Each structure stands twice: as structure tokens, then as C-alpha cells.
Swiss-Prot record, chain A:
The gene is motB. Keywords: Cell inner membrane, Cell membrane, Chemotaxis, Flagellar rotation, Membrane, Transmembrane, Transmembrane helix. GO terms for molecular function: identical protein binding. Disulfide bonds: none annotated. Each stator complex is composed of 4 MotA and 2 MotB subunits. 2 A subunits and 1 B subunit are thought to form a single ion channel, so that each stator complex contains two channels. It is found in: Cell inner membrane. MotA and MotB comprise the stator element of the flagellar motor complex. Required for the rotation of the flagellar motor. Might be a linker that fastens the torque-generating machinery to the cell wall. It comes from the Bacteria. One of its GO terms (cellular component) is bacterial-type flagellum stator complex. It is a single-pass type II membrane protein. This is Motility protein B. GO terms for biological process: bacterial-type flagellum-dependent cell motility; chemotaxis. Residues 7-130 form the OmpA-like domain.
Length: 146, 147
């Protein structure tokens, strides 16, 4: 699915070759722009405390004819560009950040065309900074340990 | 107390204003490297399912003595350098990533130097990708709510 759940938040998975003109570009295709607007709009309906981290991943195919010096960098620029478009479409900048995994920790091994493709993605990870449990513990800790 | 807990994980706050040559640089002061080695040393006392994210934050002071074109970029490069020094000292690349908040999410209002200086931060966040509860919910959703 485009949507996956883990215990500390939600992940929207956007394949990089739908998003970007080519293997080393960070320019977003016109036909996906309003798909990102649609993500910005649904963000406006989420709990006030939601944080949105735009995450870049790449396969490990060596970089060729590009100003980008590493996968880390390509992934960073990609996640950043998607985050920028979310801001254009009205998302509060104080609810956003971007991240880069480069070619590390792939979804699939980098040994087929299909697999490398899965490793090429931007994930939009939705979580919150909740700390009630942490406050609870700390207050009880200070009360019951010296 | 360089350590803060939130319900999804742990936040280690680095002495960022000491680690970097100046506040608009991404070059680490070589004298301070021991501090990053120290952290690196301890990370291996953590299981490999732990994910380690280095994140950069800055004040909103207009950029000055730098090739970088934005706060987002300065904070990214700083988080990245720390991430790279962690790799240097043995931390597994497959557990590591870096993030930038630029000048967003200040911890203090940007309205005095000392407050501004508080907003320049590098932090390491520790978490996991646990999905038991989600799997449990999904199993029960398919069963009692089939589509």
C-alpha cells in the first residue's frame, strides 16, 4: 500500500520514479504536484501535535553526471524538495523536517531492477512528540527513588 | 539531562556550540572529537533494531560566513558531519540517518543572543520500528471488519 502503519506513526510511500524527472534529479514531475497538495490538505485535518518528517532513500547504483556527491546528498535534496512543496501547499513549517538514509538499510536487496526501484522512495512519516508517559515516569521516579 | 525522554524514544542533546568551529560552520573542532567517539562507543551497547537519527536545528539569524544557502542546508550539513564521525568510530551505517529542521521548531524565542544560541542544536534521537500493536490491530480489523 501507499500507506503503512507502525506503532509510533504512519508512513506514506512515494516511489521516486513517479516523483522525479530522472534518476539523479530532485525536480518534481508536474503530474505529481497536486498529489503532494492533496497530502498538504489532509495534513490540515490531523491532530494539532502531528509532526511530518519527509524521508529520502535511494538504491546504491553509483552516481553519474550529477552535482550530487553521494546518495546521502541525493536523498537529502529529494526529501527537502518534497518538504518544500508541502510548505508551498500550506503546511506549517514548524510541523516539518526532512531526512536522508542515503542507500543504507534498503527495503529489498540491490540485486534486481525491481528491487532497486523499491529502494528509491520518499516516505512521509507522521508521528507526534507525546511525552505524558515520560512525564508520568519521571514524576514517579523523583517521588519514589531518593 | 543531556538526555530527554519522549514516549517514542530518547533524545541525546550534544554540546553543538562546542563541537563546531563556529555556529555557521559544519567543521567539527578536532579537540572535541573525543566527545563523539564517547557516544559512538556507547551506541554499540544498543541492539541493532535501534535506529539512530542525528538532527540539526539553528536560530534564525541571517546567514553570514558560509557557502550554505539556507538554515535548512546548514542544519543538514551539521547533522550529516556528526553522523559521519559516528560512522568513523564504528557505528553501523545501516542504523544511521540525518535530519534538518532548519530554523523551525525553536526551543526559545529568537530575541536575544543566548536564546538564539539555545536554538542552534544537534541531537541524536533513538527509536525503533516496532509494529506489533499495528499487526494486532490489523489482524482484528480483517476479522471483525472484513472488506
Amino acid at each position: 500500500s501507499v500507506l503503512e502503519q507502525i506503532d509510533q506513526g504512519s508512513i506514506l510511500k512515494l516511489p521516486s520514479n513517479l516523483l522525479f524527472e530522472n534518476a539523479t534529479s530532485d525536480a518534481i514531475n508536474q503530474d505529481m504536484m497536486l498529489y503532494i497538495e492533496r497530502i498538504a490538505k489532509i495534513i490540515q485535518k490531523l491532530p494539532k501535535r502531528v509532526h511530518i518528517n519527509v524521508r529520502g532513500f535511494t538504491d546504491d547504483t553509483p552516481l553519474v553526471k550529477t552535482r550530487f556527491k553521494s546518495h546521502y546528498e541525493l536523498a537529502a535534496n529529494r526529501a527537502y524538495r518534497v518538504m518544500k512543496v508541502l510548505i508551498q501547499y500550506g503546511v506549517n513549517p514548524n510541523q516539518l523536517s526532512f531526512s536522508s538514509y542515503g542507500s543504507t538499510n534498503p527495503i529489498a536487496p540491490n540485486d534486481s531492477l525491481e528491487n532497486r526501484m523499491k529502494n528509491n522512495r520518499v516516505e512521509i512519516f507522521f508521528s507526534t512528540d507525546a511525552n505524558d508517559l515520560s512525564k508520568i515516569h519521571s514524576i514517579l521516579d523523583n517521588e519514589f527513588n531518593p
